[PDB]
């Protein structure tokens, strides 16, 4: 099975809770040395210490992905601690339903958060994945980059931009041996309203962050060695 | 024939040359009063004067769509000259192939020009279209919003963002009686041409009047129940 | 102003009611000579007579699109009265929610009715459009060729096949001067809190009239769409129903 | 780890050589009892006994998926041999460029081979996956179900129909605990025109059948337990033209 991450160094952003924490833990179990980062230093340090206790190699840092100070800090810290960069999980991001008439300061924020930060991070990491022989980029998107709904003028445009950025920079950094893929998570179990939302999920249950973690582990692994420019929706079969 | 634009006021950005100029002319022939705008005052004024000579109502303005001063100026000038806003054709834009290692500022410029400008323009124009009993917005995207290619890190992401912005803000301004659609133009007329036509099954390149008539359909009462759609005018292939 | 239908002969299949009748009538107003066909001859004859009453050129025929005898009859038919074929609207189709364990003959039926019929009709009509100088093929698909939902194992597959067949045979009959486009209609109008519930997902706050699909088709089969081919236009008011 | 298939029974169709052969050999390493089937008994028997020699559980039967004779035969043979059905890999397909003016006996072929077959197969397998507590159906499709090209009147329509049939019957058999996914492979390794097709493949190399085999293993494993109605393109990041 080429589903292990041995000799891998994986930078996981927004990885103190939820999908990022699960991705970091599962990647570490797979043999990858994990640079856990978050907007909060305390959560990232906690997750990294938990990983080290489990028997893995990890460090914990504070990173605001929108701050190039912090981005170069994370890149340099990964290089100092582990010597190379081979996996970049851009899970950091946010945004939500904003009105059509929103202040433009919110529209620009949605793209500086969900898109600009991760593109700059991929720019920063791609050269180090090149003398490393190749790497894997994984941007964690959302199901709003494909679906059309109200109040999604900022979030949805940003997530679809993430998707097509994946599909396109698959072509630029391919020669570097780098694979760009994305994961679109659905409803994650971090109640008649819950069952009403399950009525459109054919598998009859909500997803666990382990689902996203395993999809990511596949996409970042040598098993996905000839997979690039792909958005994989983990939704149980619906919206 | 509900393919006329009588009692219509159409703002057309980047309309001194090419697709925008042909859209302005075709919309004026359809009976619409056209606020031609451009980054260069002289071209917009020339196109507007030619339209007025041909027998239509038009004005010409300088507008950097990235400048909110210019945007409010165009909105107020349209409301002064013609009393209402019913059609907004965001043809203004640009960018192109930039390297993956491009300076970020390039990546922010691609979106401020190709996305943020037209979203702020739609924001400014939506209340007046609602007041005027509804209207139509048409974003002039590019085929890079769908295709995947090299050097398209910023252009492709911005264009797919325009596509999904169209699809989604069709839902917000729908209740206002506003339809949002987008045109993706192929290769435009203005042995690699033979590769172009190896791809284009119709064996010829497209004239700006093709995009003009597609826009005229999408901004006319004949498309009164069409919104959230991206029409690709490529002759049936990719160039 | 290329939205006029002069010197055109359109074959509109399933043109007795709804989208088909609206398409036949609006094409005839545009100046096209309309071969109205339907599964029944009385409905097609009623629509054709009504178009001739409006002041258009129209004939009415019985056609089961799955019967090649009927297909050849319709081609020869229009061909004998008008002399040419320049437009082909494949609106004739059917099917709906069938279970996953459906009898496989039902599954073959979905494709024979919604796909094999219109592909054979396009095959027959391409030489004459070619011969004419140019032509237009418009396949009336469904929003189920794109959307994913229960009980659509046969209908959704067939309509997605229609969509991609459009996109690809746009490459084949391109050199003939023929354009292949598709229309995906939304919810059509023909104290309804379920109707308002389905309107909650339609941003324009109303249901679409058959005239909307009629005008969209008219555009796509018009000289104004002269450089448009291989495209599926969804007329849904901006949502899903 | 959930990248296994212990306590699994797999019906792979089209596995004398290529993607199906790799899928049968790789699913068996995951511990799955594999029912290797194909058009010729010789190749399916050969592959099946090779999975046996390595240490897996397998058999090799004749199956022409357009023949309901063989269709029920493989269902009842997998139950005879292993007792349950939990995984169904529909790789058996084929076809290619045909003229626009083709007969109905080429178009109908393409659809009875690429689509009707795997649908009847999924129909047959679904009640046993329901009986066995859920399972995975995996249709092998094509990049022509997304991309447009000349002569693709029958191949492209059929594979796009496969894509959408996946996306839709994900809703039908979901309640049964079944996940339906699809793989779209690129150019498979089995030259300078090769470098010309590689100029559109960013990873600068062609794909091996093990790539599709491992994407399939992921898509039919417990690690993809909440993934359904998806089409995964294994293409190296681009399209390859032959």
Automatic annotation (TrEMBL), chain A:
GO terms for molecular function: cholate 7-alpha-dehydrogenase (NAD+) activity; nucleotide binding. One of its GO terms (biological process) is monocarboxylic acid metabolic process. It comes from the Bacteria. Its EC number is 1.1.1.159. NAD(+) 2 binds at residues 19, 38, 64-65, 91, 142-143, 155, 159. NAD(+) 4 binds at residues 38, 64-65, 91, 159, 186. NAD(+) 1 binds at residues 16-17, 19, 38, 64-65, 91, 141, 159. It is an enzyme of class 1 (oxidoreductase). Keywords: Nucleotide-binding, Oxidoreductase. NAD(+) 3 binds at residues 19, 38, 64-65, 91, 155, 159, 186. Belongs to the short-chain dehydrogenases/reductases (SDR) family. This is 7-alpha-hydroxysteroid dehydrogenase. The chain holds residues 54 to 300 of 304 of the full protein.
């Amino acid at each position: 099975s080429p589903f292990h991450l041995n000799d891998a160094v994986a930078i996981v952003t927004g990885a103190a809770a939820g999908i990022g924490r699960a991705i970091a833990g599962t990647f570490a179990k797979a043999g990858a040395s994990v640079v856990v980062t978050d907007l909060k230093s305390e959560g990232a340090e906690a997750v990294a210490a938990a990983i080290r206790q489990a028997g893995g190699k990890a460090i914990g840092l504070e990173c605001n992905v929108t701050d190039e100070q912090h981005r170069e800090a994370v890149i340099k810290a990964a290089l100092d601690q582990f010597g190379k960069i081979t996996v970049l999980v851009n899970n950091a991001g946010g945004g939500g339903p904003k009105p059509f008439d929103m202040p433009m300061s919110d529209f620009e924020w949605a793209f500086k958060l969900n898109l600009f930060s991760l593109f700059r991070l991929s720019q920063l990491a791609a050269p180090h994945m090149q003398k490393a022989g190749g790497g894997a980029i994984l941007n964690i998107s959302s199901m709003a980059g494909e679906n059309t709904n109200v109040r999604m003028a900022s979030y949805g445009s940003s997530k679809a931009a993430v998707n097509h950025l994946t599909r396109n920079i698959a072509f630029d950094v391919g020669p570097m041996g780098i694979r760009v893929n994305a994961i679109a998570p659905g409803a994650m179990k971090t109640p008649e309203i819950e069952r009403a939302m399950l009525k459109h999920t054919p598998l009859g249950r909500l997803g666990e962050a382990q689902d996203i973690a395993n999809a990511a582990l596949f996409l970042c692994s040598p098993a996905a060695a000839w997979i690039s420019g792909q958005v994989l929706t983990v939704s149980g079969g619906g919206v």
